[PDB]
């Protein structure tokens, strides 16, 4: 039918990657070996007796988290091609993973890519995991995301980055990384979307009371939210929205494409049960800020544009009077220019669980994906990082050293700077 | 090879006991201190959610590390659920089924799906104690 | 992929490093025979990084003895786990070099780094593809600084691209050994600055201090505080050997901890570190780990880390754990010792989860701090040099031996310099 | 006369099924010596094979299997080096699926039954004894030897231990898998091992 | 006379065979 | 004291009379 | 023998789950 490619770069990209392909394989009835005993072939392909094959490639420098895919569980369900492994880490440069043992791997990377978009016609676009703050996965993030906006330049292409969280790092040249893949983001992918790891951790810790989580527990959140939005391509629902029309309703402006995400409901296994889980107050527990899924207070911006997915029984009467009582709720605003500022899509099938896992079943859910100008905030703090850094030019000499040219500190700086007067401008 | 302990002597569990419920495999020692903080606590919990209503909802099968006949009885004796049999293989090929060492490792409960694996895992060495209300049997029972 | 090549030279670092390869197959789980004992997968996997397949089954480390006197050397192989080393990787001195760094630098050594450039040459160059040299090594004595530094230079002329980290253990404070520690410490710093990538600090003093309060043993030998150094060195790689849920590599720490090249020392600590009588009444967990390993009476460098800032550093913690508390604690003893930190370097500390915890425990973290309170042992050194130089003491061995007047100047003058750069940044 | 002739079980194999032929002839235009397609051997009798916990498994539930032989040694540090692996591969091979797909036999090179139980305790797949006349006659089979200590019929030593055969249902090798051997593919050639093709008839 | 390797990977211990919806 | 012979070609390694396809 | 615990409470032994009425 019509397809989706799913691209892992850096530790995260993989880590992220794999319960969104845990959740996927789950929802489809296929087993870890890749056989089951057309709604999946959004996800996976055929191959001869019977067995499916993800549309995914993996890729990292380091070998040590790709190559314990390779003796993990699903061994056969991947390609042992689609998992490409180097031999030396990037090491938190992005100097280092874009210009001197970037190009030996790129290669190789998108061999499968073209080979694996070449099986069919007509396919939606790219779904691309990396972190931010990593070597690999903002150096060869960057250079798919170039090399693939030259040759498939027409078509989508989605990011979902673990952006660097405002306190804490768990590293320390994180701001350089962050600011130079800005400026190699904002001119080669369509829509990012914005992820924070401990927005994450205060959303484990209120509303599902895990007060001592873990990685398994980050990624699981995430399969579902990534499930929830590409729902629609999958299972046939009352009024579907696919990847395409997610930039025509989401992106007014070429520059301006940095939103946030949401789900609602993250509820536990005892919890949910005892409630009802209202379409009205399933939305009322998705505008708050300490739901949405970025540690970024939206207070003080302003909404350009919102796209909900529903996921369930849901009925189209009370989509549309859950989204009335929300902007005639006084706490959020609006811009003035965009008054049709709502996009709505709902899907039949309800929301698959990992049994034993974290979350629960629930008869609906909804997804997020909202454009804001609160993205100010979380550039500027992130400038206020690298103002300092940059004063007194520490961590660059490793940057400097591999062949990147000083000045691109300089000329990414004020991106950033033209990037942040843009949003401000937007807001007015 | 599962046996059901009632008032008087020892009887075989028919397979329709396990239908339509969750079932918790719970591996435990006997007189070691945190088994001896789990087993009432969890007899606790198994007794107000069986009792409350009419239908029984969960079943967990108990399986020892033990190293005496005395003392698996002893450890078996004082708890309402069923068990497994010392004597069967079933009990050391769980084990090495499902690696536990044999220490942090105790007690522990996987509930299981009906394939008789992993449906889900669950360790109590930890300083919360909320995990029996959270393990929940709405979501993983069998047909 | 990667392998790490183990040089040991010196008497210190032979001891320091015979140790170091018992625990490292402990962890691996081999026998001292060579075979392998411990049923997982997880051992095995990626065990070429430290040794090499024989085609008898067994493993050989990847290590090269070094030393001048064939008395050192006797002792590693008379040990247990003294089989495993290749008898072809040990190499002799027939000479000696008696403390003097000049011999172990310029004349002795000289004619014997031929011999052993050699044995590191047909290693390294038989792998797939290098990372990088770790050495231990002492810098009191002759042979450790003389001849341990010179293989330094030497091989990063050679590859100069790969990594480069150094177990050094430095002139103790209080008492000493090797008299003319200033005329073998100073004029290898000078030279460690210029060629090494890491450094790593450790002191007697320390680890005597260490092993006083914390472990309360009566009477530490050198085999439990080479035991003790040594579970700090497999603490920094073990993201290597074992995967977990935050990677990193010698080269994920080089980036991480360096703000500018010239600063790369640094100071190493490790915990949980409890008595054989307190064993059992402790709660391992993540508080009480961070708690232990930020305090100045942890340290392997007593030099006071509270007298100083500290730049960069990193907490590599181990074991079956959890990602939050870890990376809150990091945070909050940020926020808490604010004035004990830098200020223009936000978020310094780094977090590296390393899923396989040491062999017989659950949960351990090791902690490498670039801080620049470790410029208190360069001026202190320092002082000790200036009182012997001024009244042209013990010179007569090294310019007798053929150096120069004018080296001792420059290697003082090297030193001052970095002294001063990192006075600057407090 | 597959894999190899002058072997023990191919030479029962033909005494047997010849005196049947000849018997079946007499109380009866048929081939005498019989062809090898219609030779015919059972292997493993009801009591040769036993499972972890020593309860006796029989022929019958070896259908539909990948079935391979384990030739291994206690003492050998390239034996000790394999078995991780190869329980990782079976553990995630038999479990990853509703039935089991591979099985693996164990016949054993070592000294004593000390050495044997020893070794055999970690080991979760099905073995057979060392008393057995079995091992021995399939060690000759499938041509497996630690050293020439035997007189072998003109042979090379096919395989040094460890070595894992896979076998068909009339003795033929389904496929041989390249540990120590013309490809020394050690320690992840049992990737290579294929369940289309090597099935238990 | 050592003992037994008791670490188990973060991944191994979860990432296993997971129950089929019916 | 001796050892045996115990060595065979690359062709007869590789090649053996293989059982023919029906 | 040491001596046991003998009491329970009056919450858990009177409060006890009832039965409908029909």
């Known amino acids: 039918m019509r397809e989706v490619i799913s691209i892992h770069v850096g530790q995260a990209g993989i880590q992220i990657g794999n319960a969104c392909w845990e959740l996927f394989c789950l929802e489809h009835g296929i087993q870890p070996d890749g056989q089951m005993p057309d709604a999946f072939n959004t996800f996976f392909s055929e191959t001869g007796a019977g067995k499916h094959v993800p549309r995914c490639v993996f890729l990292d420098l380091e070998p040590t988290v790709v190559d314990e895919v390779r003796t993990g569980t699903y061994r056969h369900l991947f390609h042992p091609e689609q998992l490409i492994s180097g031999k030396e880490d990037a090491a938190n440069n992005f100097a280092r993973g874009h210009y001197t043992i970037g190009k030996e791997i790129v290669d190789l990377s998108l061999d499968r890519i073209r080979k694996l978009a070449d099986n069919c016609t007509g396919l939606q676009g790219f779904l691309m995991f990396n972190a931010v703050g990593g070597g690999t996965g903002s150096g060869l993030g960057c250079l798919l995301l170039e090399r693939l906006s030259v040759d498939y330049g027409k078509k989508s292409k989605l990011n979902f980055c673990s952006w660097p969280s405002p306190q804490v790092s768990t590293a320390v040249v994180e701001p350089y990384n962050s600011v130079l893949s800005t400026h190699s983001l904002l001119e080669h992918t369509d829509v990012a979307v914005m992820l924070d790891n401990e927005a994450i951790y205060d959303i484990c810790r209120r509303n599902l009371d895990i007060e001592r989580p873990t990685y398994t527990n980050l990624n699981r959140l995430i399969a579902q939210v990534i499930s929830s939005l590409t729902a629609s391509l999958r299972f046939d629902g009352a009024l579907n929205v696919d990847v395409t029309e997610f930039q025509t309703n989401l992106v007014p402006y070429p520059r301006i494409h940095f939103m946030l995400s949401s789900y609602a409901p993250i509820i536990s296994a005892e919890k949910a049960y005892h409630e009802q889980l209202s379409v009205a107050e399933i939305t009322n527990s998705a505008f708050e800020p300490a739901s949405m899924m970025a540690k970024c207070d939206p207070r003080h911006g302003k909404y350009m544009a919102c796209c909900l997915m529903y996921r369930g029984d849901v009925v189209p009467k009370d989509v549309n009077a859950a989204v009335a009582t929300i902007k005639t709720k006084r706490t959020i605003q609006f811009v003035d220019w965009c008054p049709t500022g709502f996009k709505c899509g709902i899907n039949y099938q309800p929301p698959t669980v990992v049994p034993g896992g974290d979350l629960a079943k629930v008869m609906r859910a909804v997804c997020m994906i909202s454009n804001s100008t609160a993205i100010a905030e979380v550039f500027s703090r992130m400038d206020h990082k690298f103002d300092l850094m940059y004063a007194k030019r520490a961590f660059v000499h490793w940057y400097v050293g591999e062949g990147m040219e000083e000045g691109e500190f300089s000329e990414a700086r004020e991106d950033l700077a033209a990037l942040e007067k843009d949003y401000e401008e937007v807001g007015i | ?143 | 992929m990667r392998e790490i090549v183990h040089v040991q030279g010196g008497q210190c670092g032979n001891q320091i490093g015979a140790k170091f390869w018992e625990v490292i197959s402990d962890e691996h789980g081999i026998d001292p025979t060579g075979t392998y004992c411990g049923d997982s997968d997880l051992q095995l996997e990626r065990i070429n990084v430290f040794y090499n397949e024989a085609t008898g089954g067994r493993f050989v480390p990847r290590a090269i003895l070094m030393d001048l006197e064939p008395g050192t050397m006797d002792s590693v192989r008379a040990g247990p786990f003294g089989q495993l080393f290749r008898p072809d990787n040990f190499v002799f001195g027939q000479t000696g070099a008696g403390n003097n760094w000049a011999k172990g630098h310029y004349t002795e050594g000289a004619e014997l780094i031929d011999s052993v450039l050699d044995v590191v040459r047909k290693e390294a160059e038989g792998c797939d593809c290098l990372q990088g040299f770790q050495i231990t090594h002492s810098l009191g004595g002759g042979t450790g600084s003389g001849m341990g530094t010179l293989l330094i230079s030497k091989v990063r002329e050679e590859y100069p691209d790969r990594i480069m980290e150094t177990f050094s253990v430095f002139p103790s404070p209080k008492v000493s050994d090797t008299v003319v520690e200033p005329y073998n410490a100073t004029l290898s710093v000078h030279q460690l600055v210029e060629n090494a990538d890491e450094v790593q600090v450790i002191d007697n003093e320390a680890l005597y201090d260490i092993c006083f309060r914390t472990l309360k043993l009566t009477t530490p030998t050198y085999g439990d505080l080479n035991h003790l150094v040594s579970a700090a060195m497999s603490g920094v790689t073990c993201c290597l050997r074992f995967p977990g849920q935050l990677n990193s590599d010698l080269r994920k720490l080089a980036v991480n901890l360096i703000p500018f090249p010239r600063l790369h020392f640094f100071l190493i600590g490790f915990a949980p570190l409890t008595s054989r009588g307190s064993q059992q009444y402790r709660a391992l967990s993540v508080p009480e780990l961070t708690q232990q390993m930020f305090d100045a009476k942890n340290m392997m460098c007593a030099s006071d880390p509270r007298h100083g800032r500290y730049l960069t550093a990193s907490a590599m913690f181990r074991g079956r754990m959890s990602t939050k508390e870890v990376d809150e604690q990091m945070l909050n003893v940020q926020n808490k010792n604010s004035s004990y930190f830098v200020e223009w370097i936000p978020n310094n500390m780094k977090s590296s989860v390393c899923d396989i915890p040491p062999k017989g425990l659950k949960m351990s973290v090791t902690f490498v701090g670039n801080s620049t309170a470790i410029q208190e042992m360069f001026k202190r050194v320092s002082d000790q040099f200036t009182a012997m130089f001024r009244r042209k003491a013990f010179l007569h061995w090294y310019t007798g031996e053929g150096m120069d007047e004018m080296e001792f100047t420059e290697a003082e003058s090297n030193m001052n310099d970095l002294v001063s750069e990192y006075q600057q940044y407090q | ?201 | ?22």
């Open chain 2, 1 to 143: 090879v599962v046996k059901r302990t009632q008032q008087g002597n020892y009887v075989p569990v028919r397979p329709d006991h396990f239908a339509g419920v969750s079932v918790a495999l719970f591996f435990a020692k006997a007189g070691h201190s945190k088994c001896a903080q789990i087993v009432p606590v969890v007899r606790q919990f198994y007794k107000t959610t069986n009792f409350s209503g009419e239908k029984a909802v969960i079943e967990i099968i108990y399986v020892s590390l033990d190293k005496d006949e005395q003392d698996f009885e002893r450890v078996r004796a004082l708890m309402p659920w069923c068990s497994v049999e010392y004597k069967s293989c079933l009990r050391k090929k769980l084990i090495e089924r499902y690696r536990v060492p044999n220490s942090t490792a105790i007690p522990l409960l996987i509930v299981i799906g009906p394939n008789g694996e992993e449906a889900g895992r669950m360790n109590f060495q930890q300083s919360d104690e909320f995990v029996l209300q959270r393990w929940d049997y709405r979501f993983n029972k069998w047909p």
């Open chain 4, 1 to 201: 006369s597959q894999p190899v002739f002058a072997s023990p079980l191919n030479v029962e194999k033909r005494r047997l099924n010849e005196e049947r032929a000849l018997m079946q002839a007499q109380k009866a235009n048929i081939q005498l010596p019989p062809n090898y397609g219609d030779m015919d051997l059972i292997l493993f009798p009801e009591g040769s094979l036993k499972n972890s916990n020593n309860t006796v498994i029989p022929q019958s539930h070896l259908k539909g299997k990948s079935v391979a032989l384990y030739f291994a040694d206690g003492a050998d540090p390239k034996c000790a080096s394999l078995l991780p692996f190869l329980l990782n591969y079976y553990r995630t091979m038999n479990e990853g699926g509703a039935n089991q797909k591979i099985e693996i036999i164990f016949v054993s090179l070592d000294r004593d039954r000390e050495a044997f139980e020893s070794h055999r305790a970690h080991m979760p797949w099905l073995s057979i004894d060392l008393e057995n006349p079995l091992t021995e006659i399939l060690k000759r089979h499938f041509r497996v030897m630690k050293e020439y200590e035997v007189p072998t019929y003109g042979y090379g030593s096919r395989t040094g231990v460890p070595s894992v055969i896979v076998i068909g249902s009339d003795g033929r090798e389904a496929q041989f898998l390249p540990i120590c051997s013309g490809l020394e593919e050690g320690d992840r050639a049992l990737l290579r091992w294929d369940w289309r093709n090597t099935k238990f008839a």
């Open chain 5, 1 to 22: 006379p050592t003992l037994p390797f008791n670490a188990q990977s973060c991944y191994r211990s979860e990432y296993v065979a997971k129950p089929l919806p019916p």
